[PDB]
């Protein structure tokens, strides 16, 4: 807390030296729409995985499968922390997220030995849950990595079913303000390009765009 | 389920479908109460609280 | 004696009864049942 100054060496250009060395150029980056309100994997940095997003099953589908279950629509819990689970979703099986990339590599007999329930067939419907729908989304990506044709995700599984207020506790790794990053300590590039990459135009909380080239606008004046 | 709720199961990994459980220290009839795992967890909190 | 091995016994008896009543209302919506 208390507004720690950060140990990065970014700086705005002064009022004395000319603007030079335009084979790198920082400018302010402003996109069209806000993405911070959206789901975490519906944001801007995950757009390329947009076709990898699992189809959504909703609350009413989950209540209908609670009341009237199907033999091959497998409800699977993807929550990892055993200290944060307090209730049982009906007709659910426990396959925690951090083991999924190993779990689908097993045979059916090894799946039965290492989890106590049968391995789902690749044509069976699989429905995944988590606290917010984040561990279930990564698990759905791991389930779609293998050739599983029908994989669905209930976004906000436990927190809407049981009414809890929990989270999957995703870190989203951001450097500590004592950790000095790469381009300050290094002779990987020449001194002009090193000074021109480390400069920015404005405060260092917003996003910027780095230009690899620039030509002078001779047609203005 | 009695062997699995103690400290000694930490030194064992098991098959979930058919877990062959270990020989606990309470499985031997010569074991006194001071060597019991679950009693020592209760004897610790009895002196504390 | 083997209802628990079939698709309509145990926890899935509620689905087979739900699909039986849902099949009846779709024949009741037309005049295939009420006539």
């Amino acid at each position: 807390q208390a507004d720690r100054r950060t140990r990065h060496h970014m700086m705005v250009d002064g009022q004395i030296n000319p603007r030079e060395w335009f084979n790198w150029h920082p400018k302010e980056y402003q996109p069209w729409y806000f993405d911070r309100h959206k789901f975490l994997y519906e944001q801007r940095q995950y757009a390329q995985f947009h076709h990898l997003l699992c189809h959504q099953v909703y609350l009413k589908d989950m209540l209908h499968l609670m009341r009237y279950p199907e033999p091959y629509t497998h409800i699977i819990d993807c929550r990892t922390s055993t200290q944060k689970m307090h209730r049982w979703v009906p007709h659910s099986l426990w396959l925690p997220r951090d083991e999924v990339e190993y779990a689908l590599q097993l045979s059916a007999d090894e799946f039965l030995d290492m989890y106590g329930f049968r391995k789902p067939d690749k044509s069976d419907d699989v429905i995944l849950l988590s606290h917010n729908g984040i561990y279930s989304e990564q698990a759905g990506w791991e389930w779609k990595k293998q050739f599983f044709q029908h994989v669905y995700n209930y976004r906000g599984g436990t927190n809407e079913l049981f009414g809890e207020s929990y989270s999957d506790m995703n870190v989203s790794d951001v450097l500590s303000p004592w950790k000095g990053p790469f381009p300050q300590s290094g002779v990987f590039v020449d001194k002009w390009s090193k000074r021109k990459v480390l400069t920015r135009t404005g405060p260092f909380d917003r996003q910027y765009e780095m230009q690899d080239f620039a030509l002078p606008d001779l047609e203005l004046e | 389920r009695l062997r699995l709720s103690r400290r000694t199961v930490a030194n064992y990994v098991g098959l979930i479908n058919s877990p062959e459980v270990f020989d606990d220290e309470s499985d031997r009839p010569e074991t006194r109460w001071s060597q019991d795992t679950f009693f020592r967890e209760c004897a610790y909190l009895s002196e504390k609280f | 004696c083997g209802v628990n091995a079939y698709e309509f016994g145990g926890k899935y008896a509620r689905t087979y009864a739900y699909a039986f009543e849902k099949a009846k209302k779709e024949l009741e919506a037309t005049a295939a049942s009420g006539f």
Partner: peptide, 28 residues
Amino acid sequence: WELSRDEQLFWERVELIRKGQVASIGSS
């Protein structure tokens, strides 16, 4: 009746797969 059996099959496998944190004792 199936929901009561399958819930006890659930929480007996959570105990088998992922063990929780062990409480404290005093070593001799």
